[PDB]
Symmetry: C5
Subunit: 310 residues, 5 copies
């Protein structure tokens, strides 16, 4: 029994984040616990302040007609408990639930460890014999405690795109809103745990540039190649199969090449010291000691620039 109206019914939405948690990079989902605020005029139940009762009249969800508000990018149905319905005299309804869903928003791993994201929450509504349109009441969308967590992320801003997008979908029109959570990843733990360790082993790798033993150099350059695969895997692990290239996926793959041409050198600095041409060998080896570090630091500037600086 929807509220009889002369035009499009405005439902006035507002989300207040109470808890954020479980941002699953692999899954590309997070979990929210918030307030939903709906409000619309159903004049059909305005109620004579003085004539009876009190200032405001309280209802159970069954009584009133409530607008069916669905979240769009959600796995299962939004899990909600009604907190209060309060009809104002003029026929204004104030609805308030507390829901918990896990939302499905895509992330952009392009700058992986140093990346910021904008999460989305949608809210559609479908029409019947009247149209409905959603819209934000900003006093109820200050959504966010001074307690919102989200481990390993810094929360920048919860806001809402005030103009809804109104599709037609299956011979009935729908009204969609875009709530936006802007977060930036807490890169750091990545330094002492991946980045720094990753470099160290690469440096040790080409400690083999001041050595003449094949046996000790294959042991060197190869044993580190392994440890890098370990790191390579450790990372490719907490991360989805993007169809593009991640920043660390680059520098991680680049690094693979320095292990190759290092191995290529050590190997050459040998079919050229067993050929009694050590003239040339100790010549190559010596250049390496400069070329490798320099080309690296260069490729990183090049690489780095190509990702962030553009």
């Amino acid at each position: 029994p929807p509220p009889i109206a002369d035009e499009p019914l405005t439902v006035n939405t507002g989300i207040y984040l109470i808890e954020c948690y479980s941002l699953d990079d692999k899954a590309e989902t997070f979990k929210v616990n918030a307030f939903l605020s709906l409000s619309w005029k159903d004049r059909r139940l305005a109620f004579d302040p003085v004539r009876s009762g009190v200032r405001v009249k309280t209802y159970e969800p069954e009584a009133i007609w409530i607008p069916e508000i669905r979240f769009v990018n959600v796995e299962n149905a939004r899990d909600a408990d009604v907190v209060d319905i309060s009809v104002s005299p003029d026929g204004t309804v104030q609805y308030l639930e507390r829901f918990s869903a896990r939302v499905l928003s895509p992330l952009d791993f392009r700058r992986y460890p140093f990346d910021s994201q904008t999460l989305h929450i949608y809210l559609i509504v479908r029409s019947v014999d009247t149209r409905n349109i959603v819209l934000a009441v900003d006093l109820e969308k200050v959504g966010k405690n001074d307690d919102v967590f989200l481990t390993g992320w810094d929360i920048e801003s919860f806001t809402a795109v005030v103009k809804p997008a109104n599709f037609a979908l299956e011979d009935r029109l729908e009204s969609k809103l875009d709530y936006q959570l802007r977060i930036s990843r807490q890169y750091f733990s990545y330094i002492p745990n991946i980045i720094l360790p990753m470099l160290f082993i690469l440096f040790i790798s080409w400690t083999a540039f001041w050595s003449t033993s094949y046996e000790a150099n294959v042991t060197l350059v190869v044993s580190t190649l392994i440890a890098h695969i370990a790191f390579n895997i450790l990372v490719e692990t907490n991360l989805p199969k993007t169809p593009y290239m991640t920043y660390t996926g680059a520098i991680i793959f680049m690094i693979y090449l320095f292990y190759f041409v290092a191995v290529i050198e050590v190997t050459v600095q040998h079919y050229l010291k067993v050929e009694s041409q050590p003239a040339r060998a100790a010549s190559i080896t010596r250049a390496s000691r400069i070329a490798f570090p320099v080309v690296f630091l260069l490729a990183n500037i090049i690489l780095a620039f190509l990702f962030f600086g553009f």
Copy 2:
């Protein structure tokens, strides 16, 4: 109380994908969040436009008789919320739910990293004292947002096999429809992370072909054999126990052989340089440097052709 009819009742189905996610290769399942659209004529409730009420009459699921529509290849019962029932004057019902199930469709790993799939969703319906037949209303089966995700997959086309397959099952007939989601895997991340790394270590492996030290060559050829097992496992891991051979499972197993005959060589190039017949040794070793790379690149063309090219 099913709608009394002179013949077979046509229910008119249509799915509109809203969300796709969690394609579990190991499990052989995905998870969908869509619209179900059913529509049938239950003349038994045609309703005098002018004589009363309005253009269309709204119902709750309890009132009307609704057809029991089950998904076939689903784990548990399809998890649904009713969005609207709308009876037309002539007795035409327009049903619309939003469901979320996880579907069980087999995948074909034969071309693994470079594979396309066709996922299925079924929908049966069983009969009573009248027969039911399902069929697609294509205006409602344009199922798919311009937002459908499915991480690590490219979505080609959501369509429906318009002719139902009508079994008899346990002295009552059923009507089944085949909805079809066609996806192709986003191979790529596999290059910088598996394929390329895998090759590199193999090349390094037979760097030992320009060396004379057993100690450094077993260190070489063997340390890489290990890293390959690492890769072998990392892969066999995100992949089910198919009874056939995968493409990468081939080239991965092939590679095992090159580590064997490499080890076989290095070993022979030694019980043949400790036998003062270095005449022959440096002869073998030299050939290897060509045979290995050539046989490989050959076996890959052979192998590759055998999978895709046929």
Copy 3:
């Protein structure tokens, strides 16, 4: 209100497998999605064909008394949706649900990779002031689609043990039936991924039998000992702690011994070449080259025979 009867009430059961999936070897459980078919005479509601209504009368589960049928070896309560109740005029009820449980049936890992299983589904029923007995109606127990999956297994046959076993349990008798799913494991992927790789590394292991360098032989025999522990673990991992010995657990443990006496040899072939008795050393080493491979191939025939051939 159970159907008043002159003797034991026969409920007529039948399962029709629609989906099979998630056979968890570690857990010792699988997951089924089937039809349950119950049928009994409750004369207490026979209904005058001509006198009123139609051929068959449809009921909701509340109306009728339905027999409480429980699955025995199930984790939680069987998860079911009623599909139809249809009373025949003579008072014959035709019940049909579609359920989904995860069943708990023990597996026999004795021949692990090459093993067949017989899964069980039970169904009890308890009595009240009348006795109940279950029994199979084979037309409804043809349970199994031509689509039943069960990844990594071949499905042989779904049948039912027609004679129920009737316990007394807590001063009331129960009737139990045994539905039986016979599957055989799809060994194969195990070859290119475990068995073959496992052997290769063992062969390489005793490549050290045609070598004289300790340094290169400990590197050899020991580096492969590691890779075997890797395989050992990869396997002991997807497998429960059986109190008996698995087939692969045997050949995997046997293999451990060849790494020991190999290491034992290389070691001896040295405190016996540093003792200027190379007379004996190169004598031992040479025998090994035959003894190891022969004893192995022998122990496998012995072992193999002991498991399958008996």
Copy 4:
């Protein structure tokens, strides 16, 4: 509406285990599927055998007042289905549910691989305006099928502590019972998979006691040190963070020491063979060959005794 009584109401409990499974060592929980049997006299509904109906009267849970029986050491609320309520003429109620919970009972890892456990299930009941007391009816507590599983454990005995413990808790008294499941771990798979393999690698470790090559001995003693860390981790993995010392945690940590002083030796047997004092070197090394094995086998007897023999 609780049964009016002249004193403390005795509810007569009894559990009959139907399924046991999922003993999670890490979590310290198992999962049971049993029968709960309650029985009490509610004279307030005695019922004239002859005067009406039959021998026993059947009820639905709503009618009667049933005692609220909670499990104490349970994660969530016990998950139950009522199987029968049967009132006897004298006003004796026979209740019977089938429940499934996962229980939280602490385990004692002190003898880890060779340990026995006593699991607990509790059952409280709280009072109102009458007191309740629980107690075991042993005919209904023979709880246990000849089918109870519990993979990797041997089930010794299901019994109940007949005297309840009656607390006061928050100005009302409660009655608690202790059901006890006594199981002993199936050590064995631990031998061919951890223990034996663990030892072998340790032996190989000090194969380095009959060798003179540093390069081959560091390769030896160190490569095995690694494999042990692998085992160390594989174990510390399926096991909780106990605040005491486990048996294998000991012998595993002990073993760490033999790798240290082995490494200490090999190292010393070198700054003492490069010092032209091989007099002493080959003297130490030779003693080791006896000291290590003997001290080990001794420390194990000492250790072993300290855990089991006391």
Copy 5:
């Protein structure tokens, strides 16, 4: 229908922990099973002791108006079963549920293995046409059995912050309470399993300080570098991405440096013994044997002090 009042309604809360478990460090959540005790005066149902019935009157949740009490830092809605409602003559209600939630409280990993935590449980309440305020009745908040578990933690004290914090939230005021569980981590298992093992391998690392073989020293210093990465990973694994530095994260990262400058030394002690300047080499190496251990033990005191001692 809320209790008509002349001022702010006091609801009197109290939690009694029955079970604690599953403190997930990664997730930053634990799981509780407790009693909730609410009590308020609803004079609107005072009831004439003598005039009728008995001392206290029992209700079902539907009858009475009950205050809606929500947990704040909870994932989903608190999962509860009502245990008793008991109205006193004066109109005093005694409510008692048993709930189970999983709570979301932040942990402080700063001293990781040696850290104490204070977990939180919140409880809000929202107002309507009267205000509500929560407060602790300490006789009901002695919350905690002498059985509360929480594996791997020592439970210090369950108490409650008696003064509620009263926000205004969306034009209605709320009353929040802070229940506090104080636990300290059971460090120990960390010694025999991480700390001790970690050190040992570091010591062995610089056993290479009493050696002259590059081949054996790269084998040494590098093979341990690997094992440390293993440990590094094993730890970074059961631990969240904090934006600060953990204590073990420090000493773990510190240790990375000793492997670098160790590798730096061994390498230098060689381009300086192949340069016929062994004068200097054996000079460096000798200092190391003191500098390394001393700088370490120093850096640890420095580090340690910086974390705990401040």
